[PDB]
Amino acid sequence: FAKEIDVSYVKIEEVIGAGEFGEVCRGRLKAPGKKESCVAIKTLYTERQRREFLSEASIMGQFEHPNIIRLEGVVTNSMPVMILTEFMENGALDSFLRLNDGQFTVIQLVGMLRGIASGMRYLAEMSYVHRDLAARNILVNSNLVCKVSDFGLSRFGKIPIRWTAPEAIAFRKFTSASDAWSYGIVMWEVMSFGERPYWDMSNQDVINAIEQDYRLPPPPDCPTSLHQLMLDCWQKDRNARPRFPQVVSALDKMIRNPASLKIVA
Numbered sequence: 001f002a003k004e005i006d007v008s009y010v011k012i013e014e015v016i017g018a019g020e021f022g023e024v025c026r027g028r029l030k031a032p033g034k035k036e037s038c039v040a041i042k043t044l045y046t047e048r049q050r051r052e053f054l055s056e057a058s059i060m061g062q063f064e065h066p067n068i069i070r071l072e073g074v075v076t077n078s079m080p081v082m083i084l085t086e087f088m089e090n091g092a093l094d095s096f097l098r099l100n101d102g103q104f105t106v107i108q109l110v111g112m113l114r115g116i117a118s119g120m121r122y123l124a125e126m127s128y129v130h131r132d133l134a135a136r137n138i139l140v141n142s143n144l145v146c147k148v149s150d151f152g153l154s155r156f157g158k159i160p161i162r163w164t165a166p167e168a169i170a171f172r173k174f175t176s177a178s179d180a181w182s183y184g185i186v187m188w189e190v191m192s193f194g195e196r197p198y199w200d201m202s203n204q205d206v207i208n209a210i211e212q213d214y215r216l217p218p219p220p221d222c223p224t225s226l227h228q229l230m231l232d233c234w235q236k237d238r239n240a241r242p243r244f245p246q247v248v249s250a251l252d253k254m255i256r257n258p259a260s261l262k263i264v265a
């Protein structure tokens, strides 16, 4: 593995959350010749489960981008198995926004979406299909920088219906274009300050609604240009959806022309 670290360099500070295979902790990483850094630690079962859990670390270690969670290291030679990443002070974006409901400006929200879109642009360029892009899988640092998290080389836990493109649900064809659909859902989550997508519907109702041309309405106070970008991401034809460089360009144009963001339906 790339970034194997001696367990003596890690001090676990406190449990900060619950992950899929175990606890999420905050800790301190101090390696010889390097400054001490704050880390988030995921601790871990069968051999296939261990290889799947560690597959997150394998791919994360091959990415380097300001909007992609940074791998600091892994503990595999010793037990328990750990994945260490940079610590993100504000945690998951959906809960962060619910805590701060209506407290960030449209320009700040657009900056967060631009950061997510830059991370996705990088992944699509690397031919990496996320498949689980959702606000709960975005982490936020003290400066409000949004980073894509939740990596893995495993195949579908269950398909996250509410965030998945219709061709991906129906034919299990996951592409950067189905991630563009998911990104549209993330835009809606952000502009709604962490509301659950299709909150008043079940998974089967969502599958039926989407197939029957229903699309999420603009969140309260959402600029029309942002809801139009959502509708573009939600085109039934995957080839008609904007690619991530187009998404970033559209958001940069909004940031540059804030008067456009004043138009609300």
Ligand SMILES: COCCNC(=O)c1ccc(Nc2ncc3cc(-c4ccncc4)ccc3n2)cc1
Pocket: 014, 015, 016, 017, 024, 040, 041, 042, 056, 069, 083, 084, 085, 086, 087, 088, 089, 090, 091, 092, 139, 149, 150, 151
């Ligand atoms: C005492 O607990 C109170 C509740 N917890 C928080 O407020 C909280 C705040 C910040 C974060 N930050 C954080 N920072 C980085 C993370 C990184 C991962 C991760 C992802 C993939 N592989 C390994 C780790 C998971 C969660 C992560 N969470 C988490 C919880």
Ligand SMILES: [Mg+2]
Pocket: 064, 065
């Ligand atoms: Mg780089």
Ligand SMILES: [Mg+2]
Pocket: 132, 150
């Ligand atoms: Mg996932």
